[PDB]
Write a protein that binds this ligand. Structure first.
Ligand SMILES: [Cl-]
Ligand SMILES: [Cl-]
Length: 97
């Protein structure tokens, strides 16, 4: 279907933003400081979803290594992989395979 991108308080909100923005160092620091990789925004998107929506491969790898649920589903029932398929980013899909 149509593409899903994301360029249009606590540590959770900051991690959601770092992931959405592809800022790996921010993501490392925030998770080290207890930011929850399971944090969710309004649309039920986790940091893994926002990184995926914007094609940030490095952030996706860091989140997965930190133990993020690769199969978490947003409010639409989509996983990061589904997002990569909808957006047509095969580089990302291969990483979430
Ligand atoms: Cl660097
Ligand atoms: Cl990245």
């Amino acid at each position: 279907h149509h593409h899903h991108h994301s360029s249009g308080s606590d540590l959770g909100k900051k991690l959601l933003e770092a992931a959405r923005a592809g800022q790996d160092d921010e993501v490392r620091i925030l998770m080290a400081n207890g930011a929850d990789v399971a944090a969710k925004d309004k649309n039920g998107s986790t940091p893994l979803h926002l990184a995926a929506r914007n094609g940030h491969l490095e952030v996706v790898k860091l989140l997965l290594e930190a133990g993020a649920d690769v199969n978490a589903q947003d409010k639409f029932g989509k996983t990061a992989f589904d997002i990569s398929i909808d957006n047509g980013n095969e580089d990302l899909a291969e990483i979430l395979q």
